[PDB]
Amino acid sequence: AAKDVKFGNDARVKMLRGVNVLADAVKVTLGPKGRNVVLDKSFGAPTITKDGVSVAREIELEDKFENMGAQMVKEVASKANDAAGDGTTTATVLAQAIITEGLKAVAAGMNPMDLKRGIDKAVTAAVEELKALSVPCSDSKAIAQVGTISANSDETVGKLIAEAMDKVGKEGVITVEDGTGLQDELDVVEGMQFDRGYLSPYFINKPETGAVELESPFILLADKKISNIREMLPVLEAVAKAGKPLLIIAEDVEGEALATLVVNTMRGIVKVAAVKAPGFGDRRKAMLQDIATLTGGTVISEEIGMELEKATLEDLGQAKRVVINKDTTTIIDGVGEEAAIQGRVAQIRQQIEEATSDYDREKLQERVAKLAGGVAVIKVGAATEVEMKEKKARVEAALHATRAAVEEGVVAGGGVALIRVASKLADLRGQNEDQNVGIKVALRAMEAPLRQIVLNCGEEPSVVANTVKGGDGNYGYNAATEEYGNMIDMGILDPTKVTRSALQYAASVAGLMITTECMVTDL
Amino acid sequence: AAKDVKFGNDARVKMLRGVNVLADAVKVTLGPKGRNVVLDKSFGAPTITKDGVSVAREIELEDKFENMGAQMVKEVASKANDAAGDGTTTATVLAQAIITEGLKAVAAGMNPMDLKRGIDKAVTAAVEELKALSVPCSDSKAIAQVGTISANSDETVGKLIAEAMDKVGKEGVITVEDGTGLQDELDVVEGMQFDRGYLSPYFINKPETGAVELESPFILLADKKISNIREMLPVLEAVAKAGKPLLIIAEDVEGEALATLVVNTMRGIVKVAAVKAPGFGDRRKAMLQDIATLTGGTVISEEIGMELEKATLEDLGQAKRVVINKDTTTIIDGVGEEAAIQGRVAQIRQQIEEATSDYDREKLQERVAKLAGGVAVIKVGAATEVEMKEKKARVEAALHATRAAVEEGVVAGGGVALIRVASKLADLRGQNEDQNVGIKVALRAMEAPLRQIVLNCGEEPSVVANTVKGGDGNYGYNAATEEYGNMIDMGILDPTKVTRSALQYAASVAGLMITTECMVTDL
Amino acid sequence: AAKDVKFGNDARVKMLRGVNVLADAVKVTLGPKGRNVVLDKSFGAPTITKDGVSVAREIELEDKFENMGAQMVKEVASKANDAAGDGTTTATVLAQAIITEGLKAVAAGMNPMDLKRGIDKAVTAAVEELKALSVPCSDSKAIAQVGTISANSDETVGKLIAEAMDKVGKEGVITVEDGTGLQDELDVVEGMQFDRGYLSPYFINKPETGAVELESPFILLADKKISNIREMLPVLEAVAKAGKPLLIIAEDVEGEALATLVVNTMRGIVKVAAVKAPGFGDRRKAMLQDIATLTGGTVISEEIGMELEKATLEDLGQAKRVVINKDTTTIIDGVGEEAAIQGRVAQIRQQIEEATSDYDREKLQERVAKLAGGVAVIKVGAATEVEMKEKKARVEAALHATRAAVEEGVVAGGGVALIRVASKLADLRGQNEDQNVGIKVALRAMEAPLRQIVLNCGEEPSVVANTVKGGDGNYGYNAATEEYGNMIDMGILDPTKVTRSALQYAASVAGLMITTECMVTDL
Amino acid sequence: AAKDVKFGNDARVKMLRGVNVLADAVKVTLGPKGRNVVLDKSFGAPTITKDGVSVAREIELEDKFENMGAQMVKEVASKANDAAGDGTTTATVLAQAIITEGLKAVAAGMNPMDLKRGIDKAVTAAVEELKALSVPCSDSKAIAQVGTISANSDETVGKLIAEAMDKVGKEGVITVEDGTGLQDELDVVEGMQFDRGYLSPYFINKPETGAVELESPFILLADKKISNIREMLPVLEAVAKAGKPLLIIAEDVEGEALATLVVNTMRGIVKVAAVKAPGFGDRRKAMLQDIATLTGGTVISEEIGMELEKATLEDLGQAKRVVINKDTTTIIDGVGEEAAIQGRVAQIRQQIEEATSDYDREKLQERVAKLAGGVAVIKVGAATEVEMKEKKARVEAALHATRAAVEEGV
Ligand SMILES: Nc1ncnc2c1ncn2[C@@H]1O[C@H](COP(=O)(O)OP(=O)(O)OP(=O)(O)O)[C@@H](O)[C@H]1O
Ligand SMILES: Nc1ncnc2c1ncn2[C@@H]1O[C@H](COP(=O)(O)OP(=O)(O)OP(=O)(O)O)[C@@H](O)[C@H]1O
Numbered sequence A, B, C: 001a002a003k004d005v006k007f008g009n010d011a012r013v014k015m016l017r018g019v020n021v022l023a024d025a026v027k028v029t030l031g032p033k034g035r036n037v038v039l040d041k042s043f044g045a046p047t048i049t050k051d052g053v054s055v056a057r058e059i060e061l062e063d064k065f066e067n068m069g070a071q072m073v074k075e076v077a078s079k080a081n082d083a084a085g086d087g088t089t090t091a092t093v094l095a096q097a098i099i100t101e102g103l104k105a106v107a108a109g110m111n112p113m114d115l116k117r118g119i120d121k122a123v124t125a126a127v128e129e130l131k132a133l134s135v136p137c138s139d140s141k142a143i144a145q146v147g148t149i150s151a152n153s154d155e156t157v158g159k160l161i162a163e164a165m166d167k168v169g170k171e172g173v174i175t176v177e178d179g180t181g182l183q184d185e186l187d188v189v190e191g192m193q194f195d196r197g198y199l200s201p202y203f204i205n206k207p208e209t210g211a212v213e214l215e216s217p218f219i220l221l222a223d224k225k226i227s228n229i230r231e232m233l234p235v236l237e238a239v240a241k242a243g244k245p246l247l248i249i250a251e252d253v254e255g256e257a258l259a260t261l262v263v264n265t266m267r268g269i270v271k272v273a274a275v276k277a278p279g280f281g282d283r284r285k286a287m288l289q290d291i292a293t294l295t296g297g298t299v300i301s302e303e304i305g306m307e308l309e310k311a312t313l314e315d316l317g318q319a320k321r322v323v324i325n326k327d328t329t330t331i332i333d334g335v336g337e338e339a340a341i342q343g344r345v346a347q348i349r350q351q352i353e354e355a356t357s358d359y360d361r362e363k364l365q366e367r368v369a370k371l372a373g374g375v376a377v378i379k380v381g382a383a384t385e386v387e388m389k390e391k392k393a394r395v396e397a398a399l400h401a402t403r404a405a406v407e408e409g410v411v412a413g414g415g416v417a418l419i420r421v422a423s424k425l426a427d428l429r430g431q432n433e434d435q436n437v438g439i440k441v442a443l444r445a446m447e448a449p450l451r452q453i454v455l456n457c458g459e460e461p462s463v464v465a466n467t468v469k470g471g472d473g474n475y476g477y478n479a480a481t482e483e484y485g486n487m488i489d490m491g492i493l494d495p496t497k498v499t500r501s502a503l504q505y506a507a508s509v510a511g512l513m514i515t516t517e518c519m520v521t522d523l
Numbered sequence D: 001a002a003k004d005v006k007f008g009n010d011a012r013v014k015m016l017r018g019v020n021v022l023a024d025a026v027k028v029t030l031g032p033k034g035r036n037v038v039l040d041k042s043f044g045a046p047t048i049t050k051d052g053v054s055v056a057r058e059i060e061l062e063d064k065f066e067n068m069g070a071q072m073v074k075e076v077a078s079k080a081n082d083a084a085g086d087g088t089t090t091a092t093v094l095a096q097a098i099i100t101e102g103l104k105a106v107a108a109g110m111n112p113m114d115l116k117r118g119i120d121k122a123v124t125a126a127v128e129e130l131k132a133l134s135v136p137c138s139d140s141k142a143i144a145q146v147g148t149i150s151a152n153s154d155e156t157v158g159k160l161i162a163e164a165m166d167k168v169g170k171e172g173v174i175t176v177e178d179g180t181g182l183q184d185e186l187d188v189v190e191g192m193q194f195d196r197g198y199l200s201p202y203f204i205n206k207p208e209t210g211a212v213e214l215e216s217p218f219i220l221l222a223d224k225k226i227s228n229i230r231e232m233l234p235v236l237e238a239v240a241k242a243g244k245p246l247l248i249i250a251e252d253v254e255g256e257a258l259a260t261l262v263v264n265t266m267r268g269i270v271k272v273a274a275v276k277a278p279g280f281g282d283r284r285k286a287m288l289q290d291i292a293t294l295t296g297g298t299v300i301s302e303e304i305g306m307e308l309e310k311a312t313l314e315d316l317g318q319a320k321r322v323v324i325n326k327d328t329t330t331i332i333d334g335v336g337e338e339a340a341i342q343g344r345v346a347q348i349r350q351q352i353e354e355a356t357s358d359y360d361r362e363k364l365q366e367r368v369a370k371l372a373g374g375v376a377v378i379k380v381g382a383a384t385e386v387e388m389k390e391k392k393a394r395v396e397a398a399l400h401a402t403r404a405a406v407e408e409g410v
């Protein structure tokens, strides 16, 4: 309908207020000092998740302007959240600080573009500093510590992550499932993961993550793309009879014919998924073979001349469950044959040795590795189902963070890195004063999140911040200890990536907010 | 329903007020001095685009009269915006100044027709002056500068435009795509562009521009027009199975049979597009052949006796993506065959030499050129996806402006041309006094936009304007420098066309507004 | 009564609103092209005026808080007119300027105390600059030039002033009275003047000028503090029998019974005015003697056992006329004994010769100066009573302008001196940035008067200000002729004292108001 | 009290509305075909009138701002009638016209100060043009023609005016009184007139015309400023004993105790009127002498040690009648001593001969003109008291129209 438009400060104020409200709840929650937040649910009794984000998610602003402004922060934060796996709150906190200052500058009537530029400039510098600052992740003990951080003092989660990580291998993928019982169960499972996208978001399953999980999926592998439904159809009919969800692997699943029917026709009355077959060329075929063996299903190729229509259900393999995400598709456990799987691995392994070339070796080795690695499953127990779900969610979050953290390496947590970088940053200047202030603002923003933790502590963040800044190297404040010590030595480290991601996003948001002269809303 | 009608000044005032509101937001934004504007979105967090227009777009007036009046300006401005590629704001600014004065004249009770005539007369004179004034665009360095202007101090965009422009060639078309990653990628791609319209706006794709982009379009080329669906249909069915969007090239696509089904029946459940085959006569056929080779598809002709029905999907070529606009249709990249494409070019090239006649040579050379030129693709990276989109939009705008600017040649920016012309204009007189005042009004209007920039500077526009006027030749004020220098030497130049376009449209709008005695609204 | 209390920005917006009503009403009258202001009167037809002091006197607001803001600025600004004989409207314009931008900065989070320190510094330096810019006015030629300028270019008024000042000293006491005919008269007479105003404003007599004239009054000298009428009734009765008015010069009159009756009761039956004796301590007694001998009366001192109960008419002194105002009492023609007066002057002259300290000598000769100085009475003659009365007003005005001019010289009028000194102070800085914006706030405020003046001229104030600032020395804009030039040569100047008082008082309230955190008023 | 403040165009529309009500009400009566206006009265039945001045007098608006607009135009326009004896309605009509279009231009963004300068110029030139267009009215034939025209074509009224003016000068003082019968009477009498009106409007007597008539009043001449009643009570008592009204000609009467009591208290017990002495400075004193000798009274001057406390009735002068208005006092029949009056006129006549400057001579002869001029009294006779009263009004009107005509033509 008609839209109400505001411009200038008036627009800004609304956004600012909205931002603060969202930020405030988040800020307190963030940090181990803060307590877990529960989100009220209209649907049922509130769900308790240890997410800064969740608070934000719940929070809606009645005021459209404020709400919209609030929304902006959240969306960006989530984006950071996804990539980093953590630091949703941090970005939010950072954004708020930046925005407020930026707004003030706007109040000043300095030209905001420069501020943004300065902020961007500062951010870039900070990022560089952070990268240098970052130090490689420590051993599993560190990993547990990393896990704990994601845990927010969930020791078990960290332990589970470490334990799972050790057995599977850090590289090896770990999957989380609801626990059978109170006691957690860690079982290694056979399976392979190949990075393949899901053809359409439509395919994307119920859960919020958007990864699709199929229960007892049926796997059809075709080297050939499926041009038309019709050939596929007779396969589908059998599948339908089984009623088990169908997962399709094709070199390409032709979108409209299959997908249009699948999505529109198949609500989830039937379940279907499609993924591109991993790899390309012979390797792709080889990969398919590896997959096929693991599944225990068979693959049909034109070259073979096997017909999809001819192929029965039996040809299709089955998986205990499959999870698909945009980046990757994995099969948690193909039923497979134990002997069959092993034999294939050996055969591939032999091939790897056989090939003189590195290239051949690499492909083969990669192929074996996927099968060999298998998948690890973690069960989270809980006193109650509700708890288990909550725990599970936390565990999952911890796992992505840990995995990210290890690869990236760890940097001092507590926003120590942020503060540390800022000091260096301060020296750096912007082209013009307006830029300069923006740069300073960014630096100020970085400092803030450290303070917030301190505030939760109840210690005066000023002193802590000052002290922290004074210390060279990794100098930081440990909330739990409430003692000064090396962050690394303490072993409380925030992932470089997460920190970097959050900062950049927040800066982006802040810059955007500052720029936005005008807001428009519906009446 | 019932309409509320106003007449006379009362109508005028409403329009005027509405105009001012829209104008005011735009005016401030316009100019590098101004800051980028963000539009609030109900849908989601606000989108930041560097568009004067966007502010206008967002702005709606609650008052119907005001709103309608506001609307009038916007629509015209956009029209100017499209043609010029830039200067949306300028037109708006110009219009507002003109309208207000005109309204005042109306208040005066001078007969407004004459004013309009004078304004038109003044405009014409101004245009002539501008054309003479304009000086050919400078080299790529200038181009970058031109790009920067579109950039609004986006150095990268200007660089990208220049870089893309250099490689492709100014004449060569450049296409923009979202960046794969943060770093921009510029890749030359094979492809040909032929200026063909889209048969129906219905075909027009989702995006606002209305250019239709198809992903992996399938190309069917027929020399023959497709009389009826039926022959086409079997082709379509295959296409549907692929599910890949279908692009159709026909000498004429018979509108109702194909299009009625396509538009109505094919929502975008399937995607189809139709374009007329480029050229006519043998040349058209030749062009088709060139296209066909590039696509890698084949063309079916009655003369050949190949049947559309007979023709399979294979006959149809594929394109990585196709973009269509009303003026032109382009294929970003036909898969083509590298050898095949090259061979054809050579063959055509040989033909060009072979033909004695210029005419034959020209056609052949044109044909080769399209294939030879290929298309250039620019990827815009961004820290965040949102940024990338914003950046991309800016880039696109810059590119049209730059392209337009180069051909037209550049004139001093800063509204220097406008002010300069006006002084000359002032001497010119109108038939009658009422006309005279209108002429003066137009001149006044031209001056204003210079002032606005100055105002953003905070320098008193009066002095600047006076100073600017005093200087002969290209004398202007550089906002960034805040120093007086030659506009050309400064290298900050606004395209002649954009300036001309904006002025004319604004004048048209202003004239229309002045004339409009009465407004009517719904109750 | 229950109060309504406001803090911070809430009290801020309130005061700003009250100040803007007062300032905007008063400033329309500023400059040669000042507009009129209509002040309603229940007494009959409205009054159309351009006297900014009259307008201010009528300003009272409904909102208790806003009214507090207005009454504050009115009280301080009035002190300027009292001190320099002019400056109130300029003081109001400046005050509004400093307060407007000051509070903006405060609301921007800047430190109120710092802001005030900066404002205060700029004013200190600026006053120094005005002192430097001042053109002296000492020689009789200068005195006359200033006089005629003030008397609207009346050579005769300038002559009168110069003649009077020459015949009684530049710092001598000069009065203006009605003429006895066509010719002007000037005669020094036995009189005196001391800085002591009326005890009650309710003593104001016919002179609308806020003064009190008493023809042939009886001077009552009592160094006692009269709080009760009882011991004074006999005197009052005797005075009443004489029908002559009375002037009570006592140590102090307390509003218990005396000042109570003298005002509340004597509203027509008698004409009684009361003032405090000059000085304090022993000097108070000595001075009363001087006044006593001068008026031929005797002082009633309890020390000598003098009883007011027995104070007969012979004890009371007398003078041809006495004029008392806010802070001054002037005894125009003492009926003292020439020889007695000469005797005292000699007696004190001797005391000076045998003085043992600078302080003694100074005060001693200040007393002889008063007695031996006399009063210069100007009798304004004319052809008609109307002319006589009008000229008399001009003489009174020119006299107060010239006296201010002899004291601190003269400076470029038209709001040019303030904008001049301000352009010099562009490099001035303070202990910190807040203090710096404080300095800028004051400098920008110094341009308000000229810009207002030019505004009433229908001209562009930012253009004229920009031009005047770019000039040097007493170069400015003559709003009368609307041409630039040398303000002093163009005869457009103000006594440096009024420009100074205006700025200082303006900065005073502006400072207090900017450092006010809470407002209390009745509900 | 808390105020309501308006600026620019807001104050503009307000004043324009108040002016339009006033002007539109008053202008309906303009011309020979002017319409009537009904003015309500609580006193009884409404008054139907065509007198635009009466209508204006009743105009007061509810909106404080609009009322300010109306009261402004009413105050200035009234000055026209006071000055020329007519012009108020025309002044209102013109004012409304100039203000209507003026404010339109102002609202159109034109400079108010410039607009006013232009208006002022056109008026300067136009007044010059009117002066050129003017047909003189000096000869007795002309005087009579204008007189009868003003008296609704009454040849007798024109004759009266012309006769009076001839017998006392065109700029001489002429009064109109009730006749003693059928025949008109005209007789020059010892009198004088000076430009000084009543101090308080509350002194208005029976004459609804905004004037005050006093039969056989006692003239009190005091060059002092009387602010308190104390030192005047004895005189007032004596005057009261005489039952005759009183005219106080002083330097100025201050509203502290004197003007206060003289008005607020003397609302029926006595008939007292007060006016300022003519001129200023030394001339003020001289003129008071002229008035003194003329009325046969003496001036109380503090300079001579004169005390109002001892001012007896013999000090007070007397006249057959005295008429005071907004800005004029006319002493119709001074009980002065013929020879004394002639003596003064001669004394001043001598002073003129030995004058040493134009200014002295001028003012000196202005004084002898007043004393030696006398007052021409017209007695309007008729067949019935009604006719007499109606004709008298016509004579008063025609007299004021003719005097204006002799001064600047027609
Ligand atoms: N004992 C500790 N001392 C210092 N800081 C700590 C300590 N333990 C954790 N932190 C810090 O607290 C922050 C992690 O908390 P949290 O995960 O709530 O923040 P977040 O990741 O931004 O919010 P969310 O997880 O909701 O996105 C990190 O900066 C982390 O280093
Ligand atoms: N440094 C500069 N000095 C002078 N003017 C400048 C400078 N850089 C750009 N400009 C001017 O600013 C204007 C371009 O800004 P902008 O693109 O916002 O205006 P617009 O094209 O009318 O608005 P929109 O792009 O929203 O349609 C041109 O007149 C351009 O010459």
Ligand SMILES: [Mg+2]
Binding pocket: A086, A087, A088, A089, A150
């Ligand atoms: Mg976290």
Ligand SMILES: [Mg+2]
Binding pocket: B086, B087, B088, B089, B150
């Ligand atoms: Mg542009």
